Amino acid sequence: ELETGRQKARGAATRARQKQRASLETMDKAVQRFRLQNPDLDSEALLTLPLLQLVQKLQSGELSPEAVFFTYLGKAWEVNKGTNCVTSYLTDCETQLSQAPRQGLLYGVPVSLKECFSYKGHDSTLGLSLNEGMPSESDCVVVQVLKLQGAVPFVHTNVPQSMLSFDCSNPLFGQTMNPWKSSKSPGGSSGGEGALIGSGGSPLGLGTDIGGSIRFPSAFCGICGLKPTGNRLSKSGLKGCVYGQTAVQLSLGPMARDVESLALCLKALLCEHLFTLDPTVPPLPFREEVYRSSRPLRVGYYETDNYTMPSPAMRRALIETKQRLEAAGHTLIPFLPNNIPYALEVLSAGGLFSDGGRSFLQNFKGDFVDPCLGDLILILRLPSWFKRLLSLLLKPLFPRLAAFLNSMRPRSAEKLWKLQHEIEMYRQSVIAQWKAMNLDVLLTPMLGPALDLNTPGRATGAISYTVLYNCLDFPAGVVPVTTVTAEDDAQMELYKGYFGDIWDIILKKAMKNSVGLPVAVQCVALPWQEELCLRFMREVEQLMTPQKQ
Amino acid sequence: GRQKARGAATRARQKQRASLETMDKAVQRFRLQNPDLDSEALLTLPLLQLVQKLQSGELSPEAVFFTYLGKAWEVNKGTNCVTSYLTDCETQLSQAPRQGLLYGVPVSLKECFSYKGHDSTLGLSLNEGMPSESDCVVVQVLKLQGAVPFVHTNVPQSMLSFDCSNPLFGQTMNPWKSSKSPGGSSGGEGALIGSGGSPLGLGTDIGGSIRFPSAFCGICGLKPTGNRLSKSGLKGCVYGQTAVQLSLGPMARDVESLALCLKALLCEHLFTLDPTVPPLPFREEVYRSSRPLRVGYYETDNYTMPSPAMRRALIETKQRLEAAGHTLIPFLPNNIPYALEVLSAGGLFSDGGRSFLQNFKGDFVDPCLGDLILILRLPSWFKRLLSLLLKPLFPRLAAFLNSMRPRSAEKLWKLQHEIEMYRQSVIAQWKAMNLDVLLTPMLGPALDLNTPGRATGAISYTVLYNCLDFPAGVVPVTTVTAEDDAQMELYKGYFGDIWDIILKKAMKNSVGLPVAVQCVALPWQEELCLRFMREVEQLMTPQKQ
């Protein structure tokens, strides 16, 4: 196919960057006009309040919806100067401020949206040139339900190009940076949400997750998030670059400063509004008594998946939370899901690249390839025979690289059926394993601390803690527990990895210079048991960081 | 290479013979020891009253079990629907949980519902002599709810048919007319329940397998949303096909029995034993509701011309629904030919049926399957060649034959996304008209034996709602009058191809056969679908309530 150059892509970028500048300029001029009429307002007293108190003050009338909106809008503008997390300001959000239903459970709460969520008259670019100049006709289902619950969506946050990366850079809107350290990644693909919420710019945000896209940004930026069962929320109206892929399940969920906020958001979304607008979502209301329950829990755990070697901080975080849960009265049981290498190398990789990434590569024609994507584009473009040959060559010395590369080959519809059946069986397998040890819930090390910029796309193996539960389709949440100590960073010199392939070499360098950065833990429950998962997350939060309760 | 098949067929016939002999000796023992017991009053009792007398202790579980077992054995003589007698039942009978909602209730299972120590042959050789080492999930919950599964019921070969014959156990017959097919693939269940051999049964449905036998034999059936109930442990031909949703559901004499069955399944035990199933309890408030309904309806899908019996059945219920204060609204799903020919056909045969064909290595092809097997065996270049050669003459056959060609994984995604968009487009219409529920004709009456496999276009009324993945249920509303049967001489179809020809002959000579109607609701609204079925039953056959 004839080369079309980069001209159309270059023009798109400048247009996108302008829409970015104009958004920020409108925000600034809107908040300066508010402060010229309300100098009395205390910003810091407002901005430090937890979402639960904030929302109940909006209800009591002690705080006006205009006050909370323009303070957070101002905070958002300020944190954006150092992080670059906002791509667009939602123009007609001020008309929503006045229309907001007073009885709505999220009344007057400013909510941030990952760019993939479509908003009327706005681009969902995904960092992809061919998607710019393409305003959405409608608000997507979840946006509509947020609005109906009194919430105020106000910003689109940055993604990495295409969203198939856990970094946060794209040739259109640039690179998002971690609010704790300029050199570090905020995570991805919901990275903008991580940088914004993490630095106090938003009390609540929404992201998507297919391989760790909610949990990576949450852990890297020291906030918490929840990836629920795939079809617990409406996926309707969401921009993606590949459609009709059901093997590995894509899901969306809340990201917030504390877990109590997450359970509020989940309760707000799970209502008649959602179930009517998207009838394909099972009408499962938020089970309150399960979330509030204070019974002792049988908690499974592991210190390592025996695939990606945890950092000393990850290991330390896991053991510390494991020990404090035993002291709390919970029974802790060693548990490790069988055949993890299988789940990732053939089930996950194969489920995401069944077509050999052909449909995926369509979005990159005549476009730039952002450096934060690594060689993923270069590798996927190679012919099937070359992917096979290279895989066989690599198999003796580099086993991980071999199996991943082989699964990125196109197969028939027949072999897709086989694959989807094998995922169903593996799901049944881990559930059986789960029940035999009679677990309530599961505790997992969460990848951390934040990796250096432009490294995540070169260390794919690190998704082995997150993508496992998109494949299994289990509700999985992430909660911050500790920060990197000086002792933790020194031990990184004595980090070898389990395989010693080029992924481990890059990951060893990426986690250095990380003192004072946050490290999180992962909480996992059985499918449809997100209220159980939140209850467990609430416990973990209470024992590790009790300031948030 | 037919030695294996002849052996498998011989062995299966011995097991079926011994199954029936065990049954006979068991019922003769109980009848002689309990001669005082009134069997006739027992069998005509509606299931709701039957469990009520069982929970109160007015009737014993031993009483209801062997009374039904005797009837099952007797009706089997004219239908050939029982494939196997599940011997564990007699010990499980004594060990039934007293608190269970289905305590002492005998349940009949389709052969694909795997039961410990028994085969799920599906009419294939390669599955004979391979007993299940485990009860499937739904079978477990039934037992945990006090139910007693007693028999395995016959299916057409490979289960991809709405007839009911296989080389192992032979042909199943409609309990109303010997020359008629009982429908399929839950054909055994249709015949058994249809003549009072069982109060309750379980079937599967990929394209009408619950709704065809229920309509043909004159009983109630429900096809829920694919994943409302646990599919774990079910035997099938091809695994991993998710585009067109496979569903399982109850089959019984009245809709009240279906609701009681669904309430029993939608419990703690099902959700614990299969956590992949969304824990949606049975919403009593919805099923029991009596608010007027905005009812969508159509008399024809403009793809398969309904029989005069069908058309009358549709309008009559529509009329009584209007008379009962329900507002009736003309409604038709968009692009039905597109949904059948490219989506539904392509969904089931994305791989050209290669995986389906593997089960037929060295096996007999039952006449009831028609030309399906040799048509699939054709190479894709030749499937394509015939496709656009037949295109000018018979578009239906041409568009089906093309959709039975192998695709790449890339092409499946494209097709899966088209199914997701179509599902959203039909919902968009549904909301635009503000519908509660949808009324649909149900292909009937029963077709003659060996013609369902030669009239593939007749799946139109059923398969569409597997493609949409909507809860759909049938309720018998009328019977074929000689007047209706006479008008079948004027039936032409919309295309006049062989599918229209075979169907014209097959539906003839049907006086006295049951005609049903179809109730459709939105995904996960099974209890609303049952509420509608309850209404349709009450207005058309008030004696059932």
From Swiss-Prot, chain A:
Changing S189A: Lowers activity 3000-fold. Lowers activity 70000-fold. The active site is at K114 (charge relay system), S189 (charge relay system), S213 (acyl-ester intermediate). It is found in: Endoplasmic reticulum membrane; Golgi apparatus membrane. The gene is Faah. It is a single-pass membrane protein. This is Fatty-acid amide hydrolase 1. It comes from Rattus norvegicus (Rat). Residues 4-375, 406-549 are cytoplasmic. The modification Phosphoserine is found at S213. Homodimer. It catalyses: N-(5Z,8Z,11Z,14Z-eicosatetraenoyl)-ethanolamine + H2O = ethanolamine + (5Z,8Z,11Z,14Z)-eicosatetraenoate; (9Z)-octadecenamide + H2O = (9Z)-octadecenoate + NH4(+); 2-(5Z,8Z,11Z,14Z-eicosatetraenoyl)-glycerol + H2O = glycerol + (5Z,8Z,11Z,14Z)-eicosatetraenoate + H(+); (9Z,12Z,15Z)-octadecatrienamide + H2O = (9Z,12Z,15Z)-octadecatrienoate + NH4(+). It is an enzyme of class 3 (hydrolase). GO terms for cellular component: endoplasmic reticulum membrane; glutamatergic synapse; Golgi membrane; organelle membrane; postsynapse; presynapse.
